[PDB]
């Protein structure tokens, strides 16, 4: 069984739109997005078709770039470090169920440099 994805919307949590969130959106999921090894990390972890029973029992906070873009579009975040947050949790995931060795640790490793990348670049707040 898979869980209910994270959450994307919320009348209740404060909301806020920033440049450096504007930021996020523009520059560093798109550029995350249209990269070859994008597609892995495009949505959450299906563990019922991939026969993945174990992985949701190991990941508790679940994390992919298709909820952090819902959240980006639909104005979720209060700052940008609550984004910032979920990309490295997404990251983080990935690292903690997967053996150093694999495809999909070269693949989130590849996009990681480029989040880093772009974060050291994330403006001030205007
Ligand atoms: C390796 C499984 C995995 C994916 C992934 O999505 N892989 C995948 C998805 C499909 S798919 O049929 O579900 N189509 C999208 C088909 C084939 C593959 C290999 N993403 C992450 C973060 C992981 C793990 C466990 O870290």
């Known amino acids: ?6 959450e994307t919307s919320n009348p209740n ?3 806020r739109q920033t440049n450096q969130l504007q930021y996020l959106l523009r520059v560093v999921l798109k ?8 597609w892995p990390f495009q949505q959450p972890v299906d563990a019922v078709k991939l026969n993945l029973p174990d992985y949701y029992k190991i990941i508790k906070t679940p994390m992919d770039m298709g909820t952090i873009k ?3 579009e639909n104005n ?19 690292y903690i169920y ?3 060795g694999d495809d999909i ?4 490793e590849a996009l990681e440099k480029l989040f880093l990348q772009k974060i050291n670049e994330l403006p001030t707040e205007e």
């Open 1 to 6: 069984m898979n869980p209910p994805p994270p």
């Open 13 to 15: 949590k404060p909301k």
């Open 31 to 38: 550029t995350l997005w249209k990269h070859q090894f994008a």
């Open 70 to 72: 819902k959240r980006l």
């Open 76 to 94: 979720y975040y209060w700052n940008a470090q609550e984004c910032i947050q979920d990309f490295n949790t997404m990251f983080t995931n990935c």
């Open 98 to 100: 997967n053996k150093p």
């Open 105 to 108: 640790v070269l693949m989130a």
